[PDB]
Structure formats: C-alpha cells, structure tokens
Design a binder for this molecule. Structure first.
Ligand SMILES: O=C[C@H](O)[C@@H](O)[C@H](O)CO
Lengths: 70, 70, 70, 70, 70
C-alpha cells in the first residue's frame, strides 16, 4: 500500500549498507542495493516518490517505490 | 515488435527486483539489472523510448528498448 | 580502426544484454557492460563519439570508443 | 557523531581504492565503493552533506553520510 | 606527483578495459573500472581534475585522481 508520497527531503547511506529516505516527514529504509543510485537521482532531480509497502509506520523497510515526474 | 513509443509516464522499482515503466498508456517490466539506471535517466530527461518485446499487452516483460532524444 | 565518428542517433539495450549505438548512420554493439551508462550519457549530452574496431561493417561488435566534447 | 556538515570541496580517488572527500575543511575516506558515484553526484550539484562516524579527526574512515538537497 | 591539472579534453574506453583521459595535453590510463563513470561525468561537466602518479610522461598509467568544482 502507499505509505508516503512526496519529494525526498534527505537521503542517507547507512553503516549497514542500507539507504534511508525521508518522504512526507517519514523516514524509510531499504536494503535493495541497486535502488540506491536511483533514489539519490530522484532526490537530486526533485521527483515525487511513492513508497509502497506492507507496513507504513515511520522507520520500516521497503523494496517498492514509484517514480513520478511532477 | 514495437510495443510502445513515447516518454516514460512513470517508472517503478518492484518487490521482485524487476523494473516497470509506463509508455503510451501501457505498463512493461524488465529484470535486466543493467536496465534500471538507464530507464530512470531516460525518464529524467524526457527521452523518447521504444519498448520492443515479444508480446505487447500491458504486464509484459521486456529486455529490449531503443533510446532516442526524439 | 575509426568505423564511425559523430553523435549517437539512438541507443539500444539488446535481448542478449549487449548494447547497440548508431553513429553516422551505422549500428554497432558492445558486450562490454561497463560501456552502457557511458554510451547513454554521450547520447544524452550530444557528445561526439568515435567507435573503434578491426572490422567496420554495420552490426559488428566493438570494444573501444572515444568520447569527445567536439 | 556528526563529523562535518557542508559542501564537498574536493573529492579524490585513492591509490588504495578508498575515496576521500573534503567537507567543512576536513578530509574523510571511505571504502564503500557504492558511495563513490553518490558523493561525486552530490559535489557537482553542491548538495550539503553530513559525514557521520564513530570518530571525527581529519583522515578518518567513514561509511555513514546524509545527503541534503535543502 | 601531480601530473596534470585541467579539464578533460577527451576520454577513451580501451579494448583492454583501461580508460584513458587527456588533460593539459597529456594522456593517462587507469584500469580501475570504478573510475570510468566518475571520469566521464567530470568531462561532461567540465570539472578540473588532477592526475596524480609516480610517472608523469604521457601514455602512462595512474590510480589516483582529484576532482574540483568551479
Ligand atoms: O549478487 C548480488 C545480488 O545481485 C544483490 O546485489 C541484489 O541485487 C540485491 O538487490
């Protein structure tokens, strides 16, 4: 389901090789290695991201995310 | 066969590590890793892509795509 | 041997995970995975590339290229 | 620990295959190859970065970094 | 030592997977495949780069490089 739709206000490369983004005032992270360069490209180029997940509370893991232009 | 032609409406990183793009009203996906950064960049810059595949209805897989600045 | 000098008219991710470019009306492929985001960038920014190989016919494999800002 | 917040002043690919960045007048290195294209991306677009690590002297190793677009 | 300081005039993916750049009249090559996308980016954007090496004569190899903005 759709956890968070907005820009990335920040992203963070973590010690455990995971990647966090803050979207709509909610941090989420992912262990999808290959997602990384993609998220940072979204951030850098002001894309709207939709973070899609089973569990949507601030701090959970994710592996699905849509990229929209806007 | 030329399935779709146009800009990427949106893209989506999928839970099974496949990558989906929407072109001329239809959704297609790839499981070629190397394809993701490539599709993203294309969307970012408004490239015109031609998805080429075996079947062309929405939901189809593809491993072939032409990039134009068209 | 300089097979084709110019700008990339279009680029293609092949079914067989190789990469095709078209330059001064002739098409070339590389199996060099490394070269993809590179070729893609040169197209995006309209660089002059010089493709190089021992055999200069259309749909020949190549493994060397010069990226210029010409 | 927030070791340094600012813009990346320069970056350097090291002989030993680590990667250094200068932020708020201090040098930090990382061995996470994955950070390299992100950090160069952040520099070119003058994002503000926060280097995070256990220890903060100049010439320390780090693997945690926040990317602000702000 | 510092071999050359300036913008990249051209770059070249060699057959052997090495990557050659030309800076201030002098060619150098690296076999660090991670350097490739970083060096193409610096060329596209016109960063000043510093090739650091044990031997500075044109045509020699390097495994260290610094990027600066503008
Ligand atoms: O062999 C490594 C795997 O390919 C892994 O990197 C996945 O891509 C994680 O998303």
């Amino acid at each position: 389901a759709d956890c968070a739709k907005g820009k990335i206000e920040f992203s963070k490369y973590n010690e455990d090789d995971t990647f966090t983004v803050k979207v709509d005032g909610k941090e989420y992270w992912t262990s999808r290695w290959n997602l990384q360069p993609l998220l940072l490209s979204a951030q850098l180029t002001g894309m709207t991201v939709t973070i899609k997940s089973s569990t949507c509370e601030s701090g959970s893991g994710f592996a699905e995310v849509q990229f929209n232009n806007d």
